[PDB]
Amino acid sequence: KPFTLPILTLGELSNSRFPAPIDMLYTDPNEAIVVQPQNGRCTLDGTLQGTTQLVPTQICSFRGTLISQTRNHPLHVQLKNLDGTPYDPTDEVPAVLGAIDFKGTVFGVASQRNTTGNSIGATRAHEVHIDTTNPRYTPKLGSVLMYSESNDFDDGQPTRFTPIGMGADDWHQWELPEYSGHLTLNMNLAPAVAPAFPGERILFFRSVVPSAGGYGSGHIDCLIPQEWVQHFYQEAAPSQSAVALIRYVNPDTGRNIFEAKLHREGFITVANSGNNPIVVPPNGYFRFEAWVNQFYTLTPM
Amino acid sequence: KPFTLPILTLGELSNSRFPAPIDMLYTDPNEAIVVQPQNGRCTLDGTLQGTTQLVPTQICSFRGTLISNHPLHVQLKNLDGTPYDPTDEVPAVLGAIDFKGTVFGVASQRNTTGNSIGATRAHEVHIDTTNPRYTPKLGSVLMYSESNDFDDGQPTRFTPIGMGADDWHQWELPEYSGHLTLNMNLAPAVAPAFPGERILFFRSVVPSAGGYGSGHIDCLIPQEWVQHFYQEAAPSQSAVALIRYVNPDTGRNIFEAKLHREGFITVANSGNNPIVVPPNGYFRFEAWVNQFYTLTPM
């Protein structure tokens, strides 16, 4: 079964680490870096890793039951899986699938539709935020702590968190949260990735997301788009080497814009050409060319 | 080139009319109906119709510039950032809300001009698509917010969340150009062609910001099918593709359905109780058939 990439253009792709469209391709203009995101992790032969799940509108969402305590009002959410199934802390995953995979304050909307009590079916929804550096951000243990200026939430009722953007100018998108709290280390992580040679840089799919105040830039970079995650998962094409050579191509004219290494682990490196941003045709997209090895030398893009 | 369906399960699929996961399959428990949604419209050979675009998180979103219950007049652009041309042969800007109701969400800004370039803000808003100023075909929509903390002249984004009031009519199209200028370039209405058949819907249950509204949004095919048909562009060998909902473990056909070339599904009405399907099941293409194929009662 031949390995293939989706033929969606840049403006037709979705971020795999935040529910947003892709705005541009991006490489670090200062240096090469090492990253370890947990959403948007899928090998080329279709193995999901980290906290990666398949629904693009559920990335960084939470689902569960509100638990009352004992101005910013605390809202403890006892989690279930985003697909409604019970959450099992013994699963070999870093946290509930879809959990926020970086340090920062994410603002969004928490909503409820009552299933028990005297008002079954009654609904409410208000802005909330989740600080993933809070010691009660414990999605591996099965709970997160939200905060809201509204106390209009019903105890014991189903509660969904939908993320919107930056709740504060405090994002560190490559710093993993402590999924089990201050005491216990992270486990079952998707591996860290980095260029294997000097002169190479990871190529990111960059989105710019909203912010509820301040001057935060709103950058979220993913290794592959969510549509690629869905594609590899379903195709499960055998990887014939550690490195697939791919080209950003103009499908109308056949012109090759630049070449890149698509690693079996599920991320892209390009040869550093080291200045100001990447210009690609809006009708173009990546196309698989051949299976190569690590000793392939990339032409500066 | 053979026709194929994605193998994603129900809980792995996205609604094509709202940014939400699919919750269940659904048919009308009383009668056959006629529907004409404008999002989630794609023929089996990959022709997008209506206001359908490809990004699943952008459905029912708006993008534009704030011009001037505090009213927020938004001059629209396309969701992919390109300018919006009202002369395009579309019912409205791609991704626009395609039903009558109050949709609540968050409006956000990041300043690009003035003395505070880069400054941001975001607040809950709602859009009443029955408002005379809901005119996404002309290129503008009116939002309302309890906060005044918005800067005019600045890029403005609306992200939908759910019901702003218990007033949804998901099959009643809005007046995209206002009370004037009846809708144009619409994706066609669809309905079962025979008695005893019903349209099979992919149903989402979305949030609500007050009241007892059910939150139902039904789509003809999931957004992943839209993306898949668009890329594959497999020629339709007949007007009706026979598909079966299968259990991949056992290979058992749970039920069969007609997948019409226009891009919607009908099943043989079996009356009673909501639909029981295994979590690991998915639709797969079986063969090309015609209108005279008799579906087994679902």
Task: Determine the 3-state secondary structure of B159 from DSSP.
Answer: strand
| Per-residue CA distances from A125 to A113, A148, B14 (Å) | 9, 11, 22
Cβ-Cβ contacts under 8 Å for B228 (sequence gap 6 or more) = B4, B5, B6
Q: Are A112 and A153 in contact (CB under 8 A)?
A: yes
Distance from CA of B120 to the nearest CA of A (A): 5
Q: Are B106 and A20 an interchain contact pair (Cβ–Cβ within 8 Å)?
A: no
Burial of A226 (0-12, 13-18, 19+ CB in 10 A): buried
β-partners of residue B76 are B64
Phi-psi region of B115 (alpha: psi -120 to 50; beta: other; left: phi over 0): alpha
CA–centroid distance for A190 within its chain:
12
Resolution in angstroms for this experimental structure? 1.7
Which residue of A lies nearest to B120 if distances are taken between CA atoms? Answer: A213
d(CA A126, CA B200): 33
CA–chain centroid gap for A129, Å, is: 18
- And the tokens for B179? 């009370």
CA A191 to chain B, closest CA, distance in angstroms equals 24
The candidate with the shortest Cα–Cα distance to B198, out of B46, B32, B42, B49, is: B32
Distance, in Å, from the CA atom of B152 to the CA atom of B74, rounded to the nearest integer, reads: 9
Mutate to test the interface with B, among A62, A85, A123, A235 (most CBs of B within 10 A): A123
CB B121 within 8 A of CB A213: yes
Inter-chain CB proximity B157 and A210 less than 8 Å: yes
Q: Which two tokens stand for residue A177?
A: 């949260």
Residue B235 sits at the vertex; the CA angle it makes with B232 and B240, to the nearest 5 degrees, is 110
Cα–Cα nearest to A138, from A86, A92, A89, A175: A89
Give A177 to chain B, closest Cα distance, Å: 25
Contact A57, A227 (CB under 8 A): no
| Structural domain spans, chain A | 1-58+168-301, 59-167
**Contact status, residue A229 vs residue A222, Cβ threshold 8 Å:** no
Q: What are phi and psi of A57, to 5 degrees?
A: -85, 5
- Residue A291 in contact with residue A244, Cβ under 8 Å? yes
Yes or no: say if A125 and A112 are a contact pair by the CB < 8 Å rule.
yes
Quote the CA–CA distance of B2 and A262 in Å, as a whole number.
28
Cβ neighbours around B238 below 10 Å, total: 15
Based on its alpha-carbon atoms, the radius of gyration of chain A, rounded to whole angstroms, reads 20
Structure tokens at A245: 């050579």
Spatial CA neighbour of A212 closest among B79, B72, B125, B19: B125
Q: Which of chain B's residues have a Cβ under 8 Å away from the Cβ of A217?
A: 118
Which residues does residue A244 pair with via DSSP β-bridges, in sequence order? Answer: A262, A291
A210–B120: do the CB atoms touch at under 8 Å? yes
Contacts of A125 in chain B (CB under 8 A): 104, 161-162, 207-210
| Paired residues of B264 in beta bridges | B260
Token digits of residue B154: 């600045």
CA–CA distance, A265 with A44 (Å, rounded to integer): 7
Report CA-CA distances (Å) from A254 to A249, A301, B46, B243. Answer: 6, 17, 22, 36
Q: Please check whether residue B222 is in contact with residue B200, taking contact to mean a CB–CB distance below 8 angstroms.
A: no
Task: Please state, in angstroms and rounded to a whole number, the distance separating the CA atoms of residues A46 and A26.
Answer: 24
3-state secondary structure of A231: helix
Strand partners, B157: B63, B108
In angstroms, the CA A226 to CA A249 distance is 20
Q: Tell me how close the Cα of B51 comes to any Cα of chain A, in angstroms.
A: 15
- B58 contacts in A (CB within 8 Å)? 21
> Residue B3 is inside which H or E element, if any?
none
Tokens of B293: 């194929």
DSSP A40: S
Could you tell me which chain B residue has the CA closest to the CA of A231?
B6
The secondary structure of residue A21, as a DSSP letter, is B
Judge contact between B156 and B76, C-beta under 8 A. Answer: no
How far CA B288 is from CA of B168, B291, B298, in Å, comes to 37, 10, 19
- As beta bridge partners, residue A111 has A125, A160
Contacts of residue B88, defined as CB under 8 A and 6 or more positions apart, other chains included, come to none
Q: Give the B window 54-83 contacts with A, CB below 8 Å.
A: 54-58, 79-81
Experimental method: X-ray
List, as one string, the DSSP characters of B222-264: -HHHHHHHHHH----SSSEEEEEEEETTTTEEEEEEEEETTTE
Nearest neighbour of B8 by CB, restricted to A20, A54, A127:
A54
Residue spans of alpha helices (H) in chain A: 226-235
The partner residue sitting opposite A230, judged by closest CB among B58, B119, B224, is B224
β-pair type (A105-113, A158-166) = antiparallel
Q: Which two tokens stand for residue A2?
A: 């031949």
Between chains, do B207 and A6 touch, taking CB under 8 Å as contact?
no
* CA–CA separation, B20 and B162 (whole Å): 10
Q: Which two tokens stand for residue B111?
A: 């300043």
